[PDB]
């Protein structure tokens, strides 16, 4: 089922979250203060049905 | 009756409030308020930094 | 009667078509579960009965 | 800035979304394709029979 | 259950099992209309034949 | 209403409706033929027995 592309989807999307994060934190990289920023993903943690 | 009844649709929906908006219209009101004076003082201190 | 065995499984597999279209329509309704129909023997009186 | 993070985030649509979704209605037209082709399929065949 | 929030629950309808269904059901069908048509055609000759 | 100025609106033909609406209804004209056919077979039946 669509499930599939569902995975992509979040993959995708994950991934280009934290990409902005890692951008905006490279050009931010001298400001007057502002420590790192890092992202934090983890599974889907629920969402399975069938055995 | 017939039973599988097809799918019909809810009409469409935007993503967007009321409250949290005219507070987000508030403060753009006061930036653009520093903003004006900071450009009107900006004018001067172009001829005084010279 | 062997006519009718076949008539009502005929009719059976129709109910059963109109289910598996509704299924397909409803492929992406949040939140829904999918739907099939349960069949039986009309046996009656003695040997297969009407279908 | 901030809020105009806020209101983005709701209100907001970006190309990798309606990708998704473009296939996945791509998907769901197809699959009615395909039924309603067994379903012209079957009447057809009971017209034969008939 | 568990609450998620920001969520929505999908359709546990698979596409592909429903696809084949379909398909045996066109086979299900067939074999009731044309055992009906066997029968009746063979049976209109003995109707006629008397 | 209001009116636009180097702008045209086009009908309400959409294929999918009409395309269908000629299926279901080609399924009808076949079906009246077939009732025609059978109610021909029954002058026929009724003409040559006697």
Known sequence: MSSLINHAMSGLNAAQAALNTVSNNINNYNVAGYTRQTTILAQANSTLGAG | ?50 | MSFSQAVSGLNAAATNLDVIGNNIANSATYGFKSGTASFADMFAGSKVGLG | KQLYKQQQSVSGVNLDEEYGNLQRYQQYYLANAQVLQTANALFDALLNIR | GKLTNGALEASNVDLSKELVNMIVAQRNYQSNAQTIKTQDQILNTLVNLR
């Open chain 2, 1 to 50: 009756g017939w039973i599988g009844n097809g799918v019909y649709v809810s009409g469409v929906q935007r993503e967007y409030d009321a409250f949290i908006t005219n507070q987000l219209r508030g403060a753009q009101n006061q930036s653009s308020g520093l903003t004006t004076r900071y450009e009107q003082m900006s004018k001067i201190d172009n001829l005084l930094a010279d």
